[PDB]
Design a protein around this ligand. Structure first.
Ligand SMILES: Nc1nc2c(ncn2[C@@H]2O[C@H](COP(=O)(O)OP(=O)(O)O)[C@@H](O)[C@H]2O)c(=O)[nH]1
Ligand SMILES: Nc1nc2c(ncn2[C@@H]2O[C@H](COP(=O)(O)OP(=O)(O)O)[C@@H](O)[C@H]2O)c(=O)[nH]1
Ligand code: NA
Lengths: 178, 179
């Protein structure tokens, strides 16, 4: 069995890609490739490389977002449990500014979503716990919270269908709701 | 909170590094960085880039190994559950050829292990289930199972301390024990 990626662009959000890796399944579990440069480099303009891997461990009913920055391409997935992954178009000059798309990523939908910069990254944890993996590609220093923009998870102008009105939020994600 | 790494070289096997990231902890859980080019690329010779990310989900009692190849640098960890990660020195020219070191890796002990080429990689799943993450750095094409070596998980010459006599194995990891 060889390493394969099914790739298609979102039908809702221009420049968002849905990457589906194949998996080797046996008695022991599964092996899969989330990323090679060879297959997924072309999703990102010349010079810009994926150079940064993060794991985010969250409990049930946690919502992180909506976070973006001006320079970071993100490849996001859930490698344990289940997240309602939601991308918002936060490009103010996009014909789909503040449109959104949900990807419910779990054991039975192992997708990686590619966000270009100026997009809203968010996830809600619908499992008991979830491990969120994401690769970042940017030039220069990491955009930490102070260099990032924030929209409210429940911003009326976005209207994301979340499975709860009452998520567990950081102070940053609460401040965005005022 | 700045992204940070504690980097230490094994006391047992020259060229094996133990990487410990810091974690942001809050009401929601934890955020941590497993890898940046800026901090970890200097572990690998100039030229060779980490360019391949893999995930292995395994049941309790699964043992995968001992697998290596002549060109692949690996950065390995467990991002859910718990594994006995065992590194073996399989460099026939090293004075610790067939010496081994164990790391029991979990959220509570988040070590990433850097393996140079010609080293034996293995892990056993001690938890209900485990997600094993590993970055590969290599020149050119992936070394698949035909381009790999395999040492028997229980090879007498290594004598690894495993928490079981009867792990769940692949055909090739079973062959190793009889061949
Ligand atoms: N789809 C996919 N299959 C893989 C990958 N890596 C290995 N395989 C397949 O899984 C099978 C077992 O590979 P092996 O290297 O023996 O696995 P291990 O025993 O878990 O280290 C072989 O057919 C491989 O071709 C991967 O990243 N993606
Ligand atoms: N140690 C460490 N801290 C981080 C990392 N990423 C973010 N942080 C810190 O965690 C906190 C929350 O960051 P934020 O981007 O709002 O996280 P989010 O709400 O999960 O998207 C801030 O204090 C960051 O500095 C990391 O990779 N390692
Ligand atoms: Na034993």
């Amino acid at each position: 069995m060889a390493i394969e990626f099914d790739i298609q662009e979102s039908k809702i959000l221009k420049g968002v890609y849905i990457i589906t890796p194949n998996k080797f399944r046996d008695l022991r579990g599964e092996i899969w490739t989330a990323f090679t440069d060879e297959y997924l480099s072309k999703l990102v303009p010349d010079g810009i490389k994926f150079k940064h891997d993060k794991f985010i461990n969250s409990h049930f009913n946690v919502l992180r977002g909506i976070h973006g920055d001006v320079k970071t391409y993100k490849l996001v997935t859930c490698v344990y449990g289940e997240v309602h992954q939601v991308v918002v178009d936060c490009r103010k000059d996009s014909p789909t500014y503040l449109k959104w798309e949900k990807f419910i990523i779990s054991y039975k939908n192992q997708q990686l979503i590619l966000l270009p910069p100026n997009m809203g990254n968010s996830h809600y944890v619908s499992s008991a716990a979830a491990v969120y993996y994401y690769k970042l590609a940017y030039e220069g220093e990491y955009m930490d919270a102070p260099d990032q923009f924030t929209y409210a998870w429940n911003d009326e102008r976005i209207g994301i269908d979340w499975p709860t009105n009452t998520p567990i939020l950081s102070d940053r994600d609460i401040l965005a709701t005022k």
